[PDB]
Symmetry: C3
Subunit: 278 residues, 3 copies
């Protein structure tokens, strides 16, 4: 009853938004990139660009966080057509997990087959340094709300297997690219937590104990939903501050944005080659 009508209404919104976007587009991208905090300038590398602001898209959330421009960018990255979310949505803004991940449902209907996720994070692995790029090999969902709770959208499984949520072959390829380009990359586990407070030292320590290498407030829900949708996932987390015991200092979102912006060109090189060698 109520759970069903909720799902029906969501399917209607997905179709209305997807129809709206097809009516605006003149390319057929098969890869999408979600650009997190400070990482929006990847879009300066997109050619033949055109843009649709989130505020103009029916049913779309809007980005309220500083450093999230709030537009969809279409164009070529290297020689392949892509679409990029220049800015994303977070559960701490007040959005439900179904609103946070609504764009991934719409990307499925637009023909996206691969999703690249990026974010700024705090490093809990003591080997990490600010500015490191961490290829995400697995994640921990530490949010209190799961985007798939409720009636199942029937094109994916009621109970998705998550043994390989991040495509192993894309990671192997990204490693090869990074080695050829001489770009240092880390690898590890991202934990997603609601925020919006940065962690206490005890909370950073907790996340280290649980096996996380980097912590942030995004990404996990979009990966879950991409997995449900059958969309392949690659993810890079940019370490923008340290949550390492003995090394914690005051952090600010302003400094996070500057650190992410400084690392963006190396991240974009890897993603551009990953798209273009496939």
């Amino acid at each position: 009853n109520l759970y069903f009508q909720s799902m029906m209404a969501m399917l209607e919104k997905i179709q209305e938004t997807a129809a709206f976007l097809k009516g605006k587009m003149h390319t057929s991208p098969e890869t999408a990139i979600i650009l997190g905090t400070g990482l929006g300038s990847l879009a300066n590398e997109i050619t033949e660009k055109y843009e649709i602001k989130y505020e103009d898209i029916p049913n779309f959330p809007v980005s309220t966080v500083e450093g999230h421009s709030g537009k969809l960018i279409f164009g070529k990255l290297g020689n392949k057509e892509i679409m990029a979310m220049q800015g994303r949505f977070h559960y701490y803004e007040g959005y439900s997990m179904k609103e946070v991940t609504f764009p991934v449902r719409v990307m499925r209907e637009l023909g996206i087959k691969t999703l690249f996720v990026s974010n700024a994070s705090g490093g809990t692995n003591p080997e990490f340094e600010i500015g490191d790029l961490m290829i995400i090999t697995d994640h921990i969902n530490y949010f209190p709300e799961h985007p798939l709770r409720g009636k199942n959208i029937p094109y994916g499984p009621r109970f998705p297997d998550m043994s390989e949520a991040y495509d192993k072959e894309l990671i192997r390829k990204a490693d090869a690219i990074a080695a050829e380009k001489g770009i240092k990359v880390q690898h590890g586990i991202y934990i997603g937590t609601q925020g919006p407070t940065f962690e206490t030292p005890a909370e950073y320590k907790l996340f280290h104990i649980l096996g996380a290498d980097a912590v942030g407030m995004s990404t996990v829900p979009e990966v879950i939903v991409a997995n449900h949708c059958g969309i392949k996932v690659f993810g890079i987390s940019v370490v923008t501050d340290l949550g390492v015991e003995g090394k914690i200092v005051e952090v600010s979102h302003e400094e996070v944005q500057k650190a992410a912006d400084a690392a963006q060109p190396k991240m974009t090189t890897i993603m551009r080659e990953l798209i273009n060698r496939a």
Copy 2:
């Protein structure tokens, strides 16, 4: 005000459903069994059976998960009258914890004094094998919603003690039965998590670090509420897949159901003797 009217409305629903069921019943069971995924065929061992479908019961949730038949079964298991929930409800379906546990509140009013809980789970203890029966000696509530939040139903404590949530004497008796019958049993801690995604390898590892031996998406809320109600609890978790580091493979709910169905006869032997020797 609002929390109170909510409780009042819940008490009204409990009484209306309990009155409905008393009006259909012609036995007085003092033990109830909740049958989880793949475990419904315990009901083929019940004699003098009669059934009430969940869809016909006022205020009852319905089971939407494959492998949950959705009926209450009354009859004798061995020589004692029981009632069995052939199928249960889960928080990942969209039900609130007060809906998930509503049947335990109704069982209190029907005179149930002991609750047996069963489920299918993923094993995180590296000694476990698919098909093992794990007697639940304690649990970890890892769900984001607690069934007792809000105004307290005054026949139980505001703050239940949970030092012995699973009756120690029923575990001792079940161990003795299993030894006499030559049925191998494990013992350990069940962790309940919302789902509906199966765990990533990092999440299985997290649950091992926290001290869990098996993980699933049910059972904990019903045990909490049974404890509040003064109903004694015994629980068996059937290990249907491994979440052990180095041994993880793709899992599916279809294979979970087949593994649980294969273990059901040994589980039922223990429960039948436990009921009949008391």
Copy 3:
């Protein structure tokens, strides 16, 4: 839209309640004390006292937990004017985190610059004994709802830094006072969890693994919001029961209250001197 109107309505309630309280007050306290379970008799040490019951304050929650009297007390502790919350609010009662922490938002508008938080807790550090006072040096937020989710109240940061949530200088001063008075104090990490069940042995063990020294069902949300408000925090947790592996026994809220009441005079000595030497 909805998140904004929600915030606007909350700002209106904060101002209406703060105006109401200013209209009743005839002192200008700069320190407030939140008194948890069993700790209300600190208010017997306040001189020139006057009281406002929570039920008479517009928009205030009321305390439904035994041992929480439900009034605001104004007067002098030593020679400084203070205000004390004699009783607090908890998420397990059904209150949202914005209701639980509404008094801290109102205290900001009343001119409070320092908040002392007190609570009764279960000890997970094996060195602790019932009746110990634990100065809180850091905390772990294990609640499923964060008081800052949603639109940010613009006088504090979207993303508060939490590297020093508990003022280090107040802890140093409290340690010095305790040493001069010969009062034994512990120091450690408080973890806040929703409740209302006391923890299972497995849950107490989990909290020990995560690095907690004491566990309770309060305090963290108020500290988060005080931090957002720019109000300095000091906190003492009174260990009222043990959640130490091998030493767990049945606990009751009645016994918790008696244990907290027995420790209150030593807690009050430290807080009174901390207020009066500043």
